[PDB]
Amino acid sequence: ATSTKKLHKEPATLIKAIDGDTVKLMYKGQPMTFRLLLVDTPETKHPKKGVEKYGPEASAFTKKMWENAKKIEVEFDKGQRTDKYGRGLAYIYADGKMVNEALVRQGLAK
Incomplete structure (x- = not known):
């Protein structure tokens, strides 16, 4: 059995709000930007592109x-x-539900 190293991280505060781009979290008294949240898997039998960017409401x-x-x-790091721009590595948890943001319709609004 391979023991997976899981880091028990603590929660942060509200410093910056953005649609998965750059969110500074109060860690050890200092703010740090982390953005890693991408999940696409529909409830349908065949998983084909889950939920997309429903809206910027996330920032709210x-x-x-x-x-x-x-x-x-924060929980664990990758x-x-x-990943995208290069600002820290952490997922933004919103209302215990991942906003899920990736691609635009099909190809940048065709």
């Missing part, structure tokens, strides 16, 4: 959904640091 969840809904916190 950090206000009410952050204080009332399962807000952002080990890449840079």
Whole structure:
């Protein structure tokens, strides 16, 4: 049995809110930008492109959904640091539900 090293990280605060681009979290008293959240898997038998960017409302969840809904916190890192732009490595948890943002319709709105 291969023991997977899981880092028990603590939750952060609200400093910056963006649609998976750059969100600074209060870690050890210092803010750090982390953006790693991408999941696409529909409930249909054959998983073909899950939910897409429903809207920028996510940035608002950090206000009410952050204080009332399962807000952002850090758990584990991937080990890449840079995925899209290159700003820290961490997933933004919004109201305990991943906003899920990837691609636009089909090809940048065709």
